[PDB]
Design a protein around this ligand. Sequence first.
Ligand SMILES: CC(C)CN(C[C@@H](O)[C@H](Cc1ccccc1)NC(=O)O[C@H]1CO[C@H]2OCC[C@H]21)S(=O)(=O)c1ccc(N)cc1
Lengths: 99, 99
Amino acid sequence: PQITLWKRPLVTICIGGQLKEALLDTGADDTVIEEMNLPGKWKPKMIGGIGGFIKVRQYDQIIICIAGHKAIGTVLVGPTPVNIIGRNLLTQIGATLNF
Amino acid sequence: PQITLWKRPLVTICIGGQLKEALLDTGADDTVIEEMNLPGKWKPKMIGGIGGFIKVRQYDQIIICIAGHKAIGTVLVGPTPVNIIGRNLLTQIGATLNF
Ligand SMILES: CC(C)CN(C[C@@H](O)[C@H](Cc1ccccc1)NC(=O)O[C@H]1CO[C@H]2OCC[C@H]21)S(=O)(=O)c1ccc(N)cc1
């Protein structure tokens, strides 16, 4: 599809068996999902942006369905205000920015 | 151009007549540039990102060239970790997400 940028580019995702709304975010290196009780091993991490840093749990090889497209990779879970699909998964669903 | 996302979508911008590097950021509503001298009037504003809220200087109707494309719009100047070109200006240069 083509997504214009008049509005936030939110799409439906499925992660850990739950549907969420998430931003397709070219400005994010990594995918950051709001606090959820995801199973399995993880590694502590801190990630920084406007305002400072949040503490997240880094999970590897997590399956996510993004707007009907499958992806698998690192997901950071923590107290983000919005669910963020970052470049690590955007590449996997074939996303480009065009102008 | 068409821009893939295996690397950060960094471009050269011209702002205040000065060249800077900035990140094309579909997850940003607004364009936020690091502290710099920029001509004319501004208003104090607060914006929030992943790590909380910061104070910025809001400049309206700023002439900015983004990878050679002309925009004129709002630029927030403040302590952002990274120069970010947000949707307010991505829409001006006709940027869409595609997959
Ligand atoms: C600042 C960027 C270099 C990085 N950010 C992604 C960015 O798209 C966030 C993504 C974002 C979106 C909403 C809320 C928090 C974070 N947007 C953002 O800060 O935008 C601000 C400027 O416009 C406003 O509109 C949205 C918030 C304001 S980030 O969220 O901080 C971030 C940092 C590290 C990772 N792995 C993932 C994301």
